[PDB]
Each structure stands twice: as structure tokens, then as C-alpha cells.
Design a protein around this ligand. Sequence first.
Ligand SMILES: *C(=O)N1CCC(N2C(=O)[C@H](c3ccccc3)[C@H]2c2ccccc2)CC1
Length: 294
Amino acid sequence: PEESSPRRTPQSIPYQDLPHLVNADGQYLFCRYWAPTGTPKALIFVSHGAGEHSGRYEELARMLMGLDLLVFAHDHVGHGQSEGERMVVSDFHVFVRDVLQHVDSMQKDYPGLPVFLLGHSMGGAIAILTAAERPGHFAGMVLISPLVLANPESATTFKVLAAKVLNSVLPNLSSGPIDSSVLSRNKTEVDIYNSDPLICRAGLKVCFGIQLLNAVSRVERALPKLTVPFLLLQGSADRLCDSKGAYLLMELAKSQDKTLKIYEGAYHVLHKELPEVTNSVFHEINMWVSQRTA
Ligand SMILES: *C(=O)N1CCC(N2C(=O)[C@H](c3ccccc3)[C@H]2c2ccccc2)CC1
């Protein structure tokens, strides 16, 4: 008997040449690490949003590593360089389970360190659910435009189409894709998003949209259990995650250490917005994590 051909990413790169982790379902997740030259003060997991991937966090990760944190991430199943049918998940909990496996694995290699989470959009719903599953385990969470409440006009349009796939057998159904111009007022960052071949810019598959509605439902039920410290950054003109969700998260979370910063006029991707906003986002995350790792 001979060993089968190396498992490769969806872009045909052997996983044996890349940092990776195999999840509970036997799926390979592509991993990224940014470690300081000294002994890290803390670990921080970066949780990307729907359709994107971990490579989009390069600059934020380098800033965090500059604070002597060991930053780590993986592409969620169905995204980027990880395995899985594109933007499909059997249940939304798979994302949370896989973050927990990676966090548990890193804490074995770097024991006794505080661990933080940083999430954007769906990645912020994943961070919230991860922290609610393990009360008292995480030192803090940084949320950038987390998915807590979808945009009201898009939630109504979807929930109707969703109950049509929920009543019949229609596997290939999909809604329309995101209008990339609403991601950011920074046109260069919108063009970069439109140029990245690791980003899935296809319309949302209805099955996946159902899992996002499950995520929103679960986030709402988790808020009375959420006690982790958090920093919440939200743009007032975000057409993807309505700002009303950020106010509801500040109100309903039980956390004793919660802070909200609103960026007036800003769109969704605050860490890739107009320079004045992006520089503030980086500075605020730096101060917030620096204060909680001293
Ligand atoms: C960050 O990762 N996200 C991706 C999903 C996106 N989104 C919602 O929220 C809407 C949704 C939610 C649940 C089921 C179906 C659709 C979509 C959306 C919003 C606005 C326009 C187009 C698509 C928020 C950001």
C-alpha cells in the first residue's frame, strides 16, 4: 500500500507546506501566526468575517504582535485556504468549535497566558458565542462591526426567501451578492476587496443565510451569559450590520467592562475605512489591549 496524494487547499497548495490544523470533522484549516521575538504577554485569536479570510488582518496582527502578543488565526471552514464547500456550514457552531480547538491547542504550547478574541462581522458573532460558551476563560474581546442584528431591510428580504427553502427542497438557492461599495468609504480598500481571489464575492447561499440567522438568534440568547470584557467598534452608516445591534449588545451584555465607540458616517470595515477612522481603530485597539495586558 502507498500513501495517497497530499491533501491540498482549494487553491491546490499542499497542506504539508502550510501551517494548519485538522478540525473535528477531519477538515484542514489553514492557520496564520504572528509571534513576537520575546516571551508573549498574551495570545489573541483573530476571527474573520463571512466571505473573507485571515490574510485580510495582516496589518492589525502586526500591530498586535508589536505589543508583544502572539496573534493567531485560521480561515473558517468554507473560506480562504481552508477546506469545505465555499461559504457552507453544517451548523454555525462548527465555527465556534473550531476556534475553541485552535485556542485550546495554542494554550498547550503557550501555557498560563491570557487569551483575547478579535472578531469582525460574522467573526464577531463567532467571538461572542466562543466567549459565552467559556465564561471567565477569555481576558477580553475586541468586536469590529459584529453580526448581532442584520440590516433590517435585508433581514426581511431574506427571512421570506429562507422560509421558501425551509418548506421545499431547493439546495442551490442564493440571494444577491453584497454591494462592495457599502463595505468602506475608502475606495482603494473596496477595489482591494474586489481584487482578492481568496474572497468569495458570490451571493449568499440560502442554507448559509439560515446559519447566519441561527448565529443572530444564538447571540441574542447568549448576551445574559456574556461577561467577558469587550471593546465594540461600530460605524453609524454600516449597511451590513445595523448600528442598532451595537447599542443592543452594550445594553444586554452582562459584562462589567464594556466600551462602545461609534464612528460617525463610517461604513462596515472600520479597520479598512478612511485613514482617520482606520488610524483611530488601530490606536483604540492598541490602548484597550495594552491596558488589559499590563
Ligand atoms: C459579516 O461577516 N457580515 C456578513 C453577512 C452580512 N449580512 C447580514 O447580516 C445579512 C443576512 C443575515 C442573515 C441571513 C441573511 C442575510 C447579510 C447582508 C446584509 C446586507 C446586505 C446584504 C447581505 C453582514 C456582514
